[PDB]
RNA sequence: GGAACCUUACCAAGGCUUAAAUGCAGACUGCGAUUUGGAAACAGAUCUCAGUUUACAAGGUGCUGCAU
RNA sequence: GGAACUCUAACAAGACUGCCAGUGCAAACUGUGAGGAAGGUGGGGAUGUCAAAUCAUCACGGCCCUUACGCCUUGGGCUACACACGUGCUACAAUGGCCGGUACAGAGAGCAGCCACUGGGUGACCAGGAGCGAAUCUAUAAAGCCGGUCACAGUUCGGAUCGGAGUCUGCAACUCGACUCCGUGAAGCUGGAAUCGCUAGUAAUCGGAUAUCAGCCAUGAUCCGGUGAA
């Protein structure tokens, strides 16, 4: 009985001009800190700099991205965009785990294509286990 | 009372000059237990009201910088 | 070296490690080595002995030492021996400044009895 | 010509190199994203109001009418009694 | 709220109205300890109620209410924003 | 017309505009919030507010 | 929606009974500074709207919001 | 020195699904275009049984005391403490701390006062002394930006506890005020079933102001402004 929805449209940012990194952003965010959020992912960027540019990155926020999702325990197709999203919180939130020195240290899983894979094989695993639904 | 002058009762002070200018007499009594300790209290015997009742305290020397009523507890737990 | 009695500052930065002496912190830490003449942001590992004995020269000018701690001790032990509120509330071992003795007195009391 | 920002708080009057309130375009807008937001492609603007990203907005809306164009309507909720902000209340048991 | 302790406070009131040259000339000071300005509640002037004082229209928060509701003090609006 | 004030946004008006035959000057609004009930029902308040209106 | 006194309605101890405030009833006239006993309240002196008897009320944050 | 803008405060226009498309006898929904706005623009004041809270805001029917359960004072208690449940703040860290440079406000208050400026003091503060009973005078924001350090743990995180020395208010700071200052570094490295709030300038986070005013427990209550999500 919500009726609606409007999806809450976005705006691009300066730098690689890319709608993609917003929402990134959007999803690191802290108690509202979006400029310290933005100088933390270009930090981690530049780290990503030793291997190429964001498109390495972008490439492995696909191998985070489920197809099928269990919510009897019965198994469906999550949507053509909740895909990112379920991603990047799934990066960002095993990336926090790693026992670096700084957040754009710990960051650098994206070349790890490493605790972000694992959780879409467990999903895919829970989902063809309950296959006869 | 906080080093802008020292902050004596004036019926305390005036009732123990006397006293401590005779010598050696009774207790003194008071109510007033916000005076501070004077070198004039030295070796002198209070009754100070508590809170139904007057406790005795008996100035030594090491006091001097306490008030009158640091002593004289006012609540009787256990 | 042992500026202190025992204490070793052990490669940390010149404040950082001085602060580590008991009796002796931040503040005083900073005077002694701005009036002493040696940089805050350089180590402890590279200081020449001139300016090690410069600094203990100074350090010896505060009461900072175990001298202190007892110092302190026989004020409480004054205090208490005497009959004073605080001296009964060191000895029973509750807050003394005013705090109420209900709850969130667990770091004055101790763990549940 | 002239323009008028008007975004949350600040104001912003556009007289159409950059300059603001005799400063430069970076004295005022030091972060990327503060330079940006003059999404457009002799100008004073005369800013005063609330904050940097205020300011960027309202010059941007007077540089758009200037010619995006649309004001945005959002404004600071106001605080409601027996709550602890405007839209949040507070915490309660046994229920 | 009752009649012997709202004159109590009038009874402070005009006792704390000499010695006003006297307290203006942390010593030399034997008083009544009532000529004090440290002792002198606000009390709503209509009632004497104590917990809860305006220091503009002098009366307690209930009083303020039934007269702002009922029409008594000029200017008082039901305020919304 | 040096200022003159009251507490109606339309009888110092008339005042003003009798006294310019024989500039708005921001308003003074005070705001009150006053606890409804005499008993504890705390989460219940009023607010009251005072216009102060002047002029010249 | 401001407990050091005051708020204060509670407790211990000193001082009051037609009352610590307010109307009245019948007389006797035109606020201050100094001194003693005191923890104060209050008593005893100088001095220069106020002070004193008689019968009247008065008063209570006393009990029941299951009389209002 | 100016009457164009912001602005203030009075009057007006503008949003009526009215415009364009399909459904329907009709109300009326589903999309587009114009516009600052949309389909109640958004937010508030409005609010048609539980013998529910108050005889402690106030009044009042009935009962009780009046050498008093009435009344003036001093001192104390309302802060008591082996334990518990509720409401909050802070920290458990390096998208963080520290010393530095650099900006951007709003509302509200000010002779029961706000303090420019100078001199003393690390500091709270003190003395002298303008302006202002208020779009005139005063009250100096943080987060943010740039640069260096720390490079991971009970730590340069943390802030309780305790000793000494001072400032302000007040007759009075021990019971029981606040602040500054030099010492010191306790529990705390994301918290068990169980439970709470939130659909847009919202949550989250940072700062400022007002109310009671001698001072103050203010981390409570009522508001405002900044950054800003899924």
New binding site residues.
Partial sequence: RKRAAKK?P?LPDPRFNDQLVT?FV????????????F??FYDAIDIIETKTSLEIWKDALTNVMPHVEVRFQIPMQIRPDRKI?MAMKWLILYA?RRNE???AQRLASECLAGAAVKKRMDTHKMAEANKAF | ????GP?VHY?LDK?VQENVESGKNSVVK?????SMITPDFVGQTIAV????QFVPVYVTENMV?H?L??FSP??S?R | ARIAGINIPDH??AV?AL?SI????????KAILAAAGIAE?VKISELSEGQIDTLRDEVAKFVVEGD?RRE?SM??KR?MDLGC??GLR?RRG??????????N?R???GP?? | I?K?G?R??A?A?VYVNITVNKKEFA??F??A?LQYKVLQPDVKVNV????????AEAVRMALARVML?????????????????????????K? | ?????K??E???EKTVA?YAEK?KA?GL?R????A???????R?KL?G????????FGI????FREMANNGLIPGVK?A?? | RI?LKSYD?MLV?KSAEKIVKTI???????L??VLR???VNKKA???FEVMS??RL
């Fill in positions: 809450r976005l929402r959007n999803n690191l965010m802290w108690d509202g800190k979006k400029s310290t959020a100088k933390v999203s926090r020195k700084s957040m | 009372s906080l080093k802008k902050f019926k009732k008071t109510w007033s237990r916000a009201h508590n809170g139904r910088g008030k009523g640091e006012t609540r737990f | 940390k930065h950082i602060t008991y009796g002796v912190g931040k503040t005083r830490s942001d202190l302190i004020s409480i205090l509120y605080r060191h509750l807050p003394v400044r005013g705090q109420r003795t209900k709850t007195a770091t004055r009391k549940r009895k | 002239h008028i008007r949350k708080t104001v009057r004295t005022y030091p972060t994203t005063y109001g609330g904050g940097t990203t205020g300011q164009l649309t004001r945005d309507p959002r404004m600071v909720e106001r605080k409601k009694f027996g709550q602890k902000k405007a839209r949040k209340r507070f915490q309660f048991s229920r | 709220a009752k009649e012997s302790m004159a109590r009038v009874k402070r000499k307290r942390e000071q008083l009544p300890k009532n004090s300005p440290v002792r002198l509640h606000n709503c009632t109620r104590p917990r809860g004082y305006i220091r503009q307690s928060r209930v009083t039901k919304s924003w | 200022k946004h008006d708005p000057l921001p308003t003074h609004k005070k009150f919030t009930s005499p008993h308040r009023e607010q209106y002047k």
